[PDB]
Design a protein around this ligand. Sequence first.
Ligand SMILES: COC(=O)c1ccc(C[NH3+])cc1
Length: 340
Amino acid sequence: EQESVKEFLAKAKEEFLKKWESPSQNTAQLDHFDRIKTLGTGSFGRVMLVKHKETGNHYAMKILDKQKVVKLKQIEHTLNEKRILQAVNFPFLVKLEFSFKDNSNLYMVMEYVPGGEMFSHLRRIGRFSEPHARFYAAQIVLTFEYLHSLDLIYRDLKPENLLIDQQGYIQVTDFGFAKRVKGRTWTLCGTPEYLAPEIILSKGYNKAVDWWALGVLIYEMAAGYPPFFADQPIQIYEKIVSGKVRFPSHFSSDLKDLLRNLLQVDLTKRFGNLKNGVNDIKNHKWFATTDWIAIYQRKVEAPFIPKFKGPGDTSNFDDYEEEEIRVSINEKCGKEFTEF
Ligand SMILES: COC(=O)c1ccc(C[NH3+])cc1
């Protein structure tokens, strides 16, 4: 309710809407870049480290195969991802620098963050101390305050999507499930361990699912494993809907209290979804040592700085089979992707 935050968010929304209404398109092409390395791969796309041939800058180029996007029912999702990313601007979101398409693929050319995914660092270290988890959590809280004020739901919070930058701060990547939603939406998406009960139960759900996922993330960062862990998805889902969570004895009382309010099965009682909105989270005791403005301004010294040798270093990412980027001589799926 600080007039300061109100005016910040009002300007943020004005700027977002202008870009949302008139999206950029076709701002580079493939032969402006050299291919370096595959950084990730999935059922309909890949992320490739590339270097711009004129500037020498490195980028993470997400390449989506239009035919596979169609087959796996991701058309609208890919259009969401690009339209949202070209319109947002926040310190903890990876920046989309260029986008374009060709006969075969869609391309989103993002700033490359060489420090790696939080997932790798968390697994390597085991767990994060509460201060370390809190530093990251505060960045997600502010990011969700920003996104939700724009009527955006993120829907893919998990450690793999949180890159650690050169200053040790988070950059959220992968807007593949992000959507502009006034009210409710219905698509089943997200990784099993992070799904809110109302997603599992096929309800019309809202931004409260992001706050649930933050609870899962904070738990996993501080414990080293997620709260509803089980060997198969159906067993995970039974635990999620049950309303039962066990906390390690090393968790502080303040942490347990915050988590009970984020991991609240009843979405109408969940922190982030009450009348006081995000302030129930920002004002919670677990965040008492957090200077929200200093986090936003990146003035807090980070818990650690990833080790890397320079902007082209791939040592914090892992190795994948290197496959061709073939571009068909014939246009595929042109109609479906006209707006991209
Ligand atoms: C800005 O995006 C990146 O730097 C990046 C994204 C995804 C991966 C692999 N999951 C690696 C790097």
